[PDB]
């Protein structure tokens, strides 16, 4: 397989849950192990904007989400915002690939500065000082020159900032196909395999 | 009327024609006078991902234009890139906000480091200059570093900077509802009316 | 009416609790809708150094000022620190001036760095990424290169800092006076009319 | 006796005379000796804003203010502001902790550029370069981002910035209690006694 | 004695318990008094890596360590992480040095942006603005860049970076001895008594 | 093979000689080749702090070495300080991994800066031109600001920062397991294999 | 005793021996322990500028100087350029004040970036780190941008920046009146009793 | 002739008199034209510090100067300090080099920050502007980092820092030898033949 064999997806409390879900797909149908995190306003944020009815615990949410995907038992881990025996929480753990998916400014705000207040904070925190891949999706607008400063400094440290800013140039004809080019392009960074968006000019050869 | 009664409107090469000439149809219904600008390579993205057969010179610009809009005789103005006489490029010109929408991560550059290759571009080094309102709306992904240093410098000087990163908690049911989101931001900057986004929480008194 | 029709005051954690109480009081009797926001430490401060006998949550507490302030109903419109459905919480919002005052050096802090960790926090993240008027009042003393950093780089982005550092040059005759000196120096801020502080010179023609 | 023997007094023209003359008074009650300056803005405040008919002359000012404070003599020496032979200008002189209270932003900016045009500016630039203790007593608002990198600029480098931003913690019941709590705060920085603001929590054991 | 009378010691959540229990039992002996503080996430630690049973609550927490360390009564006071009242909180306490060890990134970060999000957190901020010794007891490998420049910015401001870096050159044993060394170099830089690490070179006198 | 053939292991004259041993013993077992350099300071500290006797000159260092870790003919290569036709000294040489441990504060700098003064330097300077990995192991403490801001330039571009700061969470029994921590930390950040230090939380699967 | 009881003197490669020799008669004078250290590029300065002849190694440099200054036994200790066993080689040391005078160019520069070459750079380095005092007395005209950035660095650290640049407002009949006046700033500079230069304005009451 | 024809001299409040005077008479000994320009406290630093009794004002400081070096009529042009109509105070004059010897630490923060409070100010300030030559004379001790900056600022803009700092390597055998090196320094800065201080090493082949 090219890409990581696992990946911690942390999902937070921007516009956007359908990009994370549709990312957890992904990675499942391509046989990836998932660390699944997610904060309590982004479980506000996907109950506000969809219909997913996800449970509040991580055991029954593990379940929920094994269900939903079609995943295998095992494949999604799912952990707690306190669980510090998770192995996201130290850089002795096995090696993952990170992305936030969306991920909020205030998320942005605590990897920048280093506050770790929280199991995806702190998870971010390890990817960097490890320099394990970090991938962040934020979703706002406009950005501040705060968020702006907060996203020049963690490019600068190497994480790539992947803003949830879809192209319209694969003829979208639904909702669904902008968040998938989104989901392509975090795909594509990771070095995983996906068919959702073609690469460009392949067939071109002259002009 | 709220909000500037002439609104210069530039489309550069980015990906999301569809928000350009969406946002040039709102102005047009609010009873603006739009001066349009447009680049060359903004013109071959409106080719590959739309269905507008957009004339190329600026005279028979000007008339399909007016008819798309619905707009009233004189009230879109089309400039060409070199039209050094057109109002946008000086500073005694009557007060004008700007918007480049698509915005590309060139124009952007441009814009930051007052390179004025083009009337777009120098109709953006005027806007910063006379402190007039300038938006910027880029569409790429993922940012890299150059590009976030170009937008932290614009915004620290007083540009808004607003991707075209759509929201998802209005119940979007196409691709037409994710663009009127961005649109919509856009208004709510210039201080114009629209009626596409409501205003958040406006009916919640507690809680 | 000059000035903001809707004005956000969100009181923490810093001494000063009557500077606050009485800008609610002058913004109320100017007709203002005010959203107001109170953190858990500031009410402990509101505790500790005043007779007010404030309710806990936001329904009794909204009744309470309501009372307190001589308000008609529905001006004074009350949120709980992570009530993101309210107005402040998002850009989307109809637009508002915020006054955090007094603003603890935790709050400064936040809002510089973007932390967003509750509704008074996002809510200035809000006001600064749409630029709407931010006004923050912070009480320390002394301050150091950590709260001066802080209140540079906001300053730098457009909030007004003004510390509650009274001036004696009306006459003041008690406590009352020099908590009416801060609240004139904000409300001349924000625009809207006040008579405890006259305009210095009004009547001085030459010399 | 804790802190140091002597103190270089200076006034500078803000608001908030009744702060400098209360600590004089503080400082002559604690058996320090005293260099008082005075600069030509001061006098003008201090005859606005007090009813204290300071002497416009060093040797009447000193016979005035030592009568004022029940000082001995030789207590409380003043100097005037282009006096280049008394200690503060010289960093040959005997050690001494200088308070500059209050500090206008003109003396402000002096010190932190290194202008010394006057004694007051120049004892400044003495204590700093002689790391002897400095401490400046701001009263402004708002605070403009020049004040503010001032502040920080001699933060940095060892000048302790206090504000007069009095707290309402200890029961005020005056203005007189308003200034004194920026007195003892003063006095603390200093290592001088004082009994005006008890020590914070000194005695609570646990919770 | 030398050195100060009253330490806070601060242990938060990294690794390294032994050595902020060994230091409280060295300041025990050299009869100072200690305000303890202790956050949920150095709990954690302590029961993962060590065998003491400290209990959760503040007030049997103070009874448990005065018997665990031999102490006087009243000489450990151990204060929970809202308490508000209790001295470290406010500037206007009496002096105290403190110490954070060990200190986590997350109270690193906290610390050098100004937070203040709890007890501990707070008491060094106040540390810096009063300028009093703080000594932070870093325990991460490897350090980011973004650890890396928290350090930077408070050492600059003067606060003590002492990694939990022992060296090897004084003959250690044991576990223990390489926590004596850290606990001794803590010690040193308070200016309090220890006979742990010997002087260097104190009794070569040439070559 | 997973990780890096060769290792360019250069040990400097900071306290933790035993950590430089260790890790060539580790690498020796996982059958790289090492390239072994060490400063004239560093001969000093294993003298110092150590019973190993290592020759002095490099062709007799060789033949200890290779005896003392169970090597193979060739497999430790050793090379003089000022021996510029060595492979580490120039970057047309094939590629290689480099940790300086223990890295010393003089060593930290020189390769900050870019001194070059020896062969150690400029094999460092080497791998920063060449984009090969690096990894510094500091022991010293406290850390000054001119520690940390050679730490952080580095860092910021690309080396990894790896501070001999063990931690305690595997149950550690003497001086040795110590040592081992630090070393698993090496060897994890070159992708090499090693047993003594568990993958955190890998059988952890909820909660 | 007011001011330090053990002085580090090392005297480096700038014009101003007599300075150096000075000093460490006043020190010898006023019963301090001096820890001396001197480079060999400052033994071939003193050798062009003085009569001074100063034996080459350290135990016939020591005797010599005990005698040149009248010292007790033990109260000059002399230590090498490469001997690490010496107490200022170490942090563990007892503390130290630490004096370079004369101060080279090349020393300044290996005190900023941290170099640590040889123990007279290496003891600057602890002095820094421990928060010790750190006087430099540079002799060089001009001073380049390189100089003035070095010492700008060091000054905002803490170390005292004092040129050999003597005044002349104390009657300076001879060479050696000039080289008192440095040496006497130095010694106002460590707290130490001199009587070369009088306190500035000591006498002076009025005016 | 090398060198400039024409150099304004000025002269400020700093200790070292002497090396001005002394100057002067060296340009009028070369034949050179002297715009002499000296400060309000300059001329009390002559007055305490050396046995010229300097007239007050310009007409009769000149009589006097002509005489007092033996100069040619019109040799010694002097001007009074608020005199705009000087060729120093406009840009529009012919080419001088200026020197600023001594230079207070007032005067070089007044040309750091362009305050051109004075014609000496302004004259530096046109100097900058066209790009003449300046040479600023600074006598202090210590340097504080205020001090440090406006010299690395002004260095790094072209000026030459040349500090009073003379050196002993020419056997100066009185304070008016030491002078002499100081002003041989300026003369060979400005390109003036001096023969008080040797070419270094000119009769030097090899070793
Ligand atoms: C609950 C909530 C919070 C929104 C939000 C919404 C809701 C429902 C929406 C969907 C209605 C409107 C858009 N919101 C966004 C948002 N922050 C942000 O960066 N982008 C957003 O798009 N916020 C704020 C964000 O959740 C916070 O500031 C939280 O403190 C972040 O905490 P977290 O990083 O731990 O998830
Ligand atoms: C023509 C072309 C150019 C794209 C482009 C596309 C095409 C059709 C697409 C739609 C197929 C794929 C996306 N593209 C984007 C893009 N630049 C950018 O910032 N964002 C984009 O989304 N570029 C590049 C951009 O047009 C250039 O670098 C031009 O030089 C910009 O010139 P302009 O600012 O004057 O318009
Ligand atoms: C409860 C409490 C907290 C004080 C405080 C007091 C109390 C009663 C006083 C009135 C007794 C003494 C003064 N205090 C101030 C203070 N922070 C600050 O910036 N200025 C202050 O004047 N603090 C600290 C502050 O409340 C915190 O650091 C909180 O974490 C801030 O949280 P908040 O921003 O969410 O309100
Ligand atoms: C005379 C005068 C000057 C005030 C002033 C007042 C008066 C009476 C008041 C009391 C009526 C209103 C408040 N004022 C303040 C003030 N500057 C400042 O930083 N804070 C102030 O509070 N200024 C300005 C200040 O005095 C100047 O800018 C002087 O040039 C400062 O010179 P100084 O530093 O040498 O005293
Ligand atoms: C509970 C827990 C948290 C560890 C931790 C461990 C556990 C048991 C160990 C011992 C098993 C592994 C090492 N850990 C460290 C760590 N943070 C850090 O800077 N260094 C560490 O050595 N963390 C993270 C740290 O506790 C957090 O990011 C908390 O949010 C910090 O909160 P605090 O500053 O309020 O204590
Ligand atoms: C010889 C010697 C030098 C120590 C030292 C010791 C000795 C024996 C010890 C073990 C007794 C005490 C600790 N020391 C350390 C140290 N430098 C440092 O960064 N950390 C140290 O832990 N130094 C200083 C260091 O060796 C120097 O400054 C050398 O110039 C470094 O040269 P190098 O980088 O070429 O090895
Ligand atoms: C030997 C030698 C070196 C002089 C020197 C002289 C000699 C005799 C003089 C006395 C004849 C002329 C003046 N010199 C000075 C000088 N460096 C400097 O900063 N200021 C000086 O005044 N240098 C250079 C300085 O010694 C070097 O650059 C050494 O490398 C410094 O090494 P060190 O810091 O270890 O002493
Ligand atoms: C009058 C006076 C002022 C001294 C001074 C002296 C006197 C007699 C001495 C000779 C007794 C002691 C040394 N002093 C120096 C000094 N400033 C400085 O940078 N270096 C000095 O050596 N000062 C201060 C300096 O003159 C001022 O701060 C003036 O405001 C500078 O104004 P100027 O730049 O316009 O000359």
Not at 86 to 106: R, Y
């Amino acid at each position: 397989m090219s890409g990581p064999e696992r990946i911690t997806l942390a999902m937070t409390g921007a516009s956007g849950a359908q990009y994370g879900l549709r990312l957890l797909d992904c990675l499942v149908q391509e046989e990836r192990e998932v660390h699944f995190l997610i904060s309590k306003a982004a479980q506000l944020v996907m109950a506000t904007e969809t219909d997913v009815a996800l449970p509040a615990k991580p055991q029954a949410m593990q379940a929920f989400l094994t269900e939903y995907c079609g995943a295998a038992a095992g494949q999604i881990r799912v952990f707690g915002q306190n669980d510090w025996m998770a192995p996201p929480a130290s850089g002795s753990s096995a090696p993952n690939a990170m992305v936030i998916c969306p991920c909020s400014t205030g998320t942005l705000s605590a990897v920048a500065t280093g506050a770790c207040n929280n199991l995806i904070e702190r998870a971010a925190d390890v990817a960097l000082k490890e320099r394990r891949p970090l991938v962040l999706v934020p979703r706002e607008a406009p950005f501040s020159s705060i968020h702006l400063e907060n996203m020049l400094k963690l490019s600068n440290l190497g994480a790539v900032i992947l803003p949830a800013a879809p192209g319209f140039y694969h003829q979208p004809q639904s909702v669904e196909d902008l968040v998938d080019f989104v989901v392509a392009r975090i795909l594509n960074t990771l070095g995983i395999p996906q068919d959702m968006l073609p690469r460009w000019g392949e067939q071109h050869l002259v002009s």
